Structures are given as C-alpha cells and as structure tokens.
C-alpha cells in the first residue's frame, strides 16, 4: 500500500513511574486514513483502546522516536483488519495491547 497522512495529535516526551523514556499521545489520531481504504471514521482508536493520555511506543522497552515513526508504522499497514503488536503503558504500568486497524468502508 501507499499511505502517509499528517500528524493531528499531540506528543509529549517525559518519564513515567517506572522510567523508560516513553511518549504519550494527548489526542486522537486513530480516526483517519488514506489509500487502500481511506475509511476515516473512527476505528483503530476505540478498537485498540487508544485514547488521550495513553502511551503509544509501538516498540519493546517502552520507548519511541517521535510521531513520524508512529505515523509511518500505522500508515505502512492499511489492511481491512491488520493485527500489529503494540506496547502501551499507563503512567508506568506495563501492559500489552493489539491494535486492529480496519480500513475501507
């Protein structure tokens, strides 16, 4: 596929109760897409549990580069139901969650 939208969320770099350098999203970007679907109507947001104040690293160890990396990984996969392993944290908490991004209508 060929997807690569623009960043419409917020990214804040800091430290959690554990301390593993992880960024958290204070917005909702999982509500739009393009190419091989371009559904855009809220899907991978609630389905994956991704909400404001959630830590999205998508990389083992609880850490991520920037929004560009998250946008590339999320864009790279535009399947009607692709299951990609993503690591999430809740203020130092360690938990695993699977994001199901379903494009198309």
PDB file of C-alpha atoms in Angstrom:
ATOM      1  CA  UNK A   1       0.000   0.000   0.000  1.00  0.00           C
ATOM      2  CA  UNK A   2       0.884   3.698  -0.112  1.00  0.00           C
ATOM      3  CA  UNK A   3      -0.274   5.693   2.911  1.00  0.00           C
ATOM      4  CA  UNK A   4       1.243   8.585   4.860  1.00  0.00           C
ATOM      5  CA  UNK A   5      -1.179  11.130   6.378  1.00  0.00           C
ATOM      6  CA  UNK A   6      -0.299  14.119   8.559  1.00  0.00           C
ATOM      7  CA  UNK A   7       0.131  14.219  12.337  1.00  0.00           C
ATOM      8  CA  UNK A   8      -3.006  15.541  14.008  1.00  0.00           C
ATOM      9  CA  UNK A   9      -2.273  14.580  17.606  1.00  0.00           C
ATOM     10  CA  UNK A  10      -0.038  15.764  20.447  1.00  0.00           C
ATOM     11  CA  UNK A  11       3.290  14.262  21.514  1.00  0.00           C
ATOM     12  CA  UNK A  12       4.898  14.911  24.898  1.00  0.00           C
ATOM     13  CA  UNK A  13       8.222  13.383  25.939  1.00  0.00           C
ATOM     14  CA  UNK A  14       8.712  12.663  29.628  1.00  0.00           C
ATOM     15  CA  UNK A  15       9.160   9.966  32.263  1.00  0.00           C
ATOM     16  CA  UNK A  16       6.731   7.522  33.874  1.00  0.00           C
ATOM     17  CA  UNK A  17       6.590   5.963  37.340  1.00  0.00           C
ATOM     18  CA  UNK A  18       8.973   3.304  36.030  1.00  0.00           C
ATOM     19  CA  UNK A  19      11.255   5.469  33.912  1.00  0.00           C
ATOM     20  CA  UNK A  20      11.839   4.065  30.434  1.00  0.00           C
ATOM     21  CA  UNK A  21      11.572   7.181  28.271  1.00  0.00           C
ATOM     22  CA  UNK A  22       8.154   6.873  26.632  1.00  0.00           C
ATOM     23  CA  UNK A  23       5.960   9.345  24.752  1.00  0.00           C
ATOM     24  CA  UNK A  24       2.221   9.712  25.347  1.00  0.00           C
ATOM     25  CA  UNK A  25      -0.496  10.955  22.994  1.00  0.00           C
ATOM     26  CA  UNK A  26      -2.892  13.549  24.407  1.00  0.00           C
ATOM     27  CA  UNK A  27      -5.085  13.401  21.302  1.00  0.00           C
ATOM     28  CA  UNK A  28      -6.846  11.000  18.935  1.00  0.00           C
ATOM     29  CA  UNK A  29      -5.123  10.280  15.623  1.00  0.00           C
ATOM     30  CA  UNK A  30      -6.776   6.897  15.090  1.00  0.00           C
ATOM     31  CA  UNK A  31      -9.733   8.460  13.278  1.00  0.00           C
ATOM     32  CA  UNK A  32      -8.443   8.971   9.737  1.00  0.00           C
ATOM     33  CA  UNK A  33      -6.517   7.243   6.950  1.00  0.00           C
ATOM     34  CA  UNK A  34      -5.940   7.017   3.210  1.00  0.00           C
ATOM     35  CA  UNK A  35      -5.019   4.728   0.324  1.00  0.00           C
ATOM     36  CA  UNK A  36      -6.141   1.095   0.196  1.00  0.00           C
ATOM     37  CA  UNK A  37      -9.157   2.181   2.223  1.00  0.00           C
ATOM     38  CA  UNK A  38      -9.139   5.790   3.360  1.00  0.00           C
ATOM     39  CA  UNK A  39     -12.101   4.937   5.573  1.00  0.00           C
ATOM     40  CA  UNK A  40     -11.517   7.649   8.175  1.00  0.00           C
ATOM     41  CA  UNK A  41     -14.402   7.421  10.644  1.00  0.00           C
ATOM     42  CA  UNK A  42     -13.040   6.254  13.998  1.00  0.00           C
ATOM     43  CA  UNK A  43     -11.988   2.613  14.145  1.00  0.00           C
ATOM     44  CA  UNK A  44      -8.485   1.699  15.363  1.00  0.00           C
ATOM     45  CA  UNK A  45      -8.934   4.300  18.102  1.00  0.00           C
ATOM     46  CA  UNK A  46     -11.581   2.703  20.316  1.00  0.00           C
ATOM     47  CA  UNK A  47     -10.981  -0.773  18.893  1.00  0.00           C
ATOM     48  CA  UNK A  48      -7.353  -0.598  20.018  1.00  0.00           C
ATOM     49  CA  UNK A  49      -8.222   1.392  23.127  1.00  0.00           C
ATOM     50  CA  UNK A  50      -6.004   4.268  22.020  1.00  0.00           C
ATOM     51  CA  UNK A  51      -7.245   7.428  23.733  1.00  0.00           C
ATOM     52  CA  UNK A  52      -5.995  10.783  25.022  1.00  0.00           C
ATOM     53  CA  UNK A  53      -3.447  10.346  27.793  1.00  0.00           C
ATOM     54  CA  UNK A  54      -2.321   6.947  26.531  1.00  0.00           C
ATOM     55  CA  UNK A  55       1.285   5.878  25.971  1.00  0.00           C
ATOM     56  CA  UNK A  56       1.954   4.641  22.436  1.00  0.00           C
ATOM     57  CA  UNK A  57       5.503   3.462  21.740  1.00  0.00           C
ATOM     58  CA  UNK A  58       4.894   0.553  19.369  1.00  0.00           C
ATOM     59  CA  UNK A  59       8.396  -0.582  20.332  1.00  0.00           C
ATOM     60  CA  UNK A  60       9.514  -3.049  23.003  1.00  0.00           C
ATOM     61  CA  UNK A  61      11.140  -1.421  26.017  1.00  0.00           C
ATOM     62  CA  UNK A  62       8.515   1.298  26.377  1.00  0.00           C
ATOM     63  CA  UNK A  63      10.032   3.975  24.142  1.00  0.00           C
ATOM     64  CA  UNK A  64       9.651   5.579  20.714  1.00  0.00           C
ATOM     65  CA  UNK A  65      11.439   8.079  18.476  1.00  0.00           C
ATOM     66  CA  UNK A  66       8.705  10.546  17.526  1.00  0.00           C
ATOM     67  CA  UNK A  67       5.311  10.942  15.853  1.00  0.00           C
ATOM     68  CA  UNK A  68       6.950  10.382  12.467  1.00  0.00           C
ATOM     69  CA  UNK A  69       7.745   6.798  13.464  1.00  0.00           C
ATOM     70  CA  UNK A  70       4.216   6.134  14.717  1.00  0.00           C
ATOM     71  CA  UNK A  71       2.749   7.665  11.557  1.00  0.00           C
ATOM     72  CA  UNK A  72       4.982   5.524   9.343  1.00  0.00           C
ATOM     73  CA  UNK A  73       4.218   2.258  11.135  1.00  0.00           C
ATOM     74  CA  UNK A  74       0.485   2.969  11.266  1.00  0.00           C
ATOM     75  CA  UNK A  75       0.448   4.141   7.649  1.00  0.00           C
ATOM     76  CA  UNK A  76       2.584   1.261   6.383  1.00  0.00           C
ATOM     77  CA  UNK A  77      -0.246  -1.033   7.484  1.00  0.00           C
ATOM     78  CA  UNK A  78      -3.595  -0.167   5.902  1.00  0.00           C
ATOM     79  CA  UNK A  79      -5.266  -3.583   5.880  1.00  0.00           C
ATOM     80  CA  UNK A  80      -9.008  -4.131   6.474  1.00  0.00           C
ATOM     81  CA  UNK A  81      -8.060  -5.864   9.725  1.00  0.00           C
ATOM     82  CA  UNK A  82      -4.301  -5.928  10.295  1.00  0.00           C
ATOM     83  CA  UNK A  83      -3.187  -7.066  13.750  1.00  0.00           C
ATOM     84  CA  UNK A  84       0.094  -5.484  14.843  1.00  0.00           C
ATOM     85  CA  UNK A  85       1.672  -5.930  18.300  1.00  0.00           C
ATOM     86  CA  UNK A  86       1.952  -2.559  20.039  1.00  0.00           C
ATOM     87  CA  UNK A  87       3.299  -1.843  23.523  1.00  0.00           C
ATOM     88  CA  UNK A  88       1.240   0.514  25.684  1.00  0.00           C
ATOM     89  CA  UNK A  89       1.815   1.989  29.143  1.00  0.00           C
ATOM     90  CA  UNK A  90      -0.438   3.635  31.726  1.00  0.00           C
ATOM     91  CA  UNK A  91       1.801   6.019  33.670  1.00  0.00           C
ATOM     92  CA  UNK A  92       4.489   3.438  34.369  1.00  0.00           C
ATOM     93  CA  UNK A  93       2.133   0.483  34.009  1.00  0.00           C
ATOM     94  CA  UNK A  94       3.213  -2.381  31.751  1.00  0.00           C
ATOM     95  CA  UNK A  95       0.554  -3.942  29.526  1.00  0.00           C
ATOM     96  CA  UNK A  96       0.263  -5.357  26.007  1.00  0.00           C
ATOM     97  CA  UNK A  97      -2.492  -4.438  23.551  1.00  0.00           C
ATOM     98  CA  UNK A  98      -3.181  -5.416  19.942  1.00  0.00           C
ATOM     99  CA  UNK A  99      -4.236  -2.656  17.549  1.00  0.00           C
ATOM    100  CA  UNK A 100      -6.737  -3.662  14.866  1.00  0.00           C
ATOM    101  CA  UNK A 101      -6.776  -1.125  12.033  1.00  0.00           C
ATOM    102  CA  UNK A 102      -9.583  -1.831   9.585  1.00  0.00           C
ATOM    103  CA  UNK A 103      -9.581   0.413   6.523  1.00  0.00           C
ATOM    104  CA  UNK A 104     -12.148   0.513   3.717  1.00  0.00           C
ATOM    105  CA  UNK A 105     -15.873   1.025   4.291  1.00  0.00           C
TER     106      UNK A 105
END
